[PDB]
């Protein structure tokens, strides 16, 4: 219904079409961090002197659903509990039940001015085309303009295109005998395409990326595990 619907649907379809391709066999990507079930890749890209390195991570998390993962990732009410790089943020506008515009500032992750970001964050269920395939839950976060948050002089305005894309594998048990969290696994794909704005050394920016993304993914996924443990399953 809202004014960004076409852009949202374009971004979701783009992530659905391009972001789920396996980069493990893609020789243009490099596996830069591995820990447990998590693998983090990047493509070294510069355009007009500036580092744009697309990043993609895959992960598989026992005992949670894509719905829960995406709920926790999207829900502003719980951002503080898991996110570490954010200094301040607020919802600038509510577009829909599932779509919000967020303004936020980031703590310095390299010695420079703080970055701010203004993005639409939407949570979407993508229906399976068949009952044999998992449904996909996706949270897309992408930079937008808003009259109420113009560029300011204290921060550099970063531009983002980020998605977390989740599918739930369920393996029904034997017996009589309900499915438990032991019977479920959430496959995650996380993509971040970020323009840091301004200027910074390629080497520091690449070091920060390699540090901050696996840190976030480990902390966030274990957080969803803790918060859902023992609770009825939200498919
Ligand atoms: C350059 C280093 C990047 C820092 C790593 C960011 C980890 C935050 C994880 C994340 O995606 O948060 C999702 C949250 C939920 O809607 O929305 C966000 O906070 C989007 C964050 C995008 C990263 C901005 C990087 C620019 C700062 C210099």
Taking the C-alpha atoms of residue 225 and residue 82, their distance in angstroms, rounded to an integer, is 12
Residues paired with 150 in a beta bridge: none
CATH class of 1-235: alpha beta
- Three-state DSSP at 154 gives coil
Pairing relationship of beta strands 115-126 and 156-157 according to DSSP bridges? parallel
CA triple 9-187-62, angle to 5 deg: 140
Q: What is the CA radius of gyration of the chain?
A: 18
Taking the C-alpha atoms of residue 186 and residue 198, their distance in angstroms, rounded to an integer, is 37
Q: Which residue has the least CA distance to atom 4 on ligand 1?
A: 212
3-state secondary structure 210-234: HHHHHHHHHHHHHHHHHHHCCCCCC
Q: Alpha helices of the chain — where are they, by DSSP H?
A: 5-14, 66-74, 79-82, 202-228
Rounded to the nearest angstrom, the distance between the alpha carbon of 163 and the centre of ligand 1 is: 10
- For the chain, give every domain's residue range: 1-235
Cis? peptide before 208, omega within 30° of 0: no
Taking the C-alpha atoms of residue 141 and residue 11, their distance in angstroms, rounded to an integer, is 9
Specify the experimental method.
Answer: X-ray
Nearest ligand 1 atom to alpha carbon 119: 20
Stated in angstroms to one decimal place, the resolution of this structure is: 1.7
Q: Provide the Cα torsion 202, 80, 233, 125; round to 10°.
A: -60
- Around ligand 1, the residues with Cβ closer than 6 Å are 73-74, 85, 106, 109, 115, 117, 121, 139, 141, 158, 160, 162, 192, 194, 196, 208-209, 212-213, 216
Backbone angles phi, psi at 193, to 5 degrees: -120, 110
Rounded to the nearest angstrom, the distance between the alpha carbon of 171 and the centre of ligand 1 is: 33
Nearest ligand 1 atom to alpha carbon 121: 16
Taking the C-alpha atoms of residue 121 and residue 163, their distance in angstroms, rounded to an integer, is 9
Q: Which residue has the least CA distance to atom 2 on ligand 1?
A: 209
Nearest ligand 1 atom to alpha carbon 139: 16
């Amino acid at each position: 219904t809202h004014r960004f619907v076409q852009k949202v649907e374009e971004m979701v379809q783009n992530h659905m079409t391009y972001s789920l391709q396996d980069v493990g066999g893609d020789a243009n990507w490099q596996l830069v961090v591995e820990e447990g079930e998590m693998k983090v890749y990047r493509r070294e890209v510069e355009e007009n002197g500036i580092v744009l390195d697309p990043l993609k991570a895959t992960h598989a998390v026992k005992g949670v659903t894509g719905h829960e993962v995406c709920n926790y990732f999207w829900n502003v009410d719980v951002r503080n509990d898991w996110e570490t790089t954010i200094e301040n943020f607020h919802v600038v506008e509510t577009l829909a039940d599932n779509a919000i515009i967020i303004y936020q500032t980031h703590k310095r992750v390299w010695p420079a001015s703080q970055r701010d970001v203004l993005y639409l964050s939407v949570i979407r269920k993508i229906p399976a085309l068949t009952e044999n395939d998992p449904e996909t839950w996706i949270v897309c976060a992408f930079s937008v303009d808003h009259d109420s948050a113009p560029l300011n002089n204290r921060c550099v305005r970063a531009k983002i295109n980020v998605a977390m894309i989740c599918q739930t594998l369920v393996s029904p048990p034997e017996g009589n005998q309900e499915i438990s969290r032991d019977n479920i696994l959430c496959k995650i794909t996380y993509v971040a395409n970020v323009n840091p704005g301004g200027w910074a050394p390629a080497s520091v920016l690449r070091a920060v990326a390699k540090r901050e993304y696996p840190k976030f993914l480990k902390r966030f996924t274990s957080y969803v595990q803790e918060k859902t443990a023992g609770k009825p399953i939200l498919f």
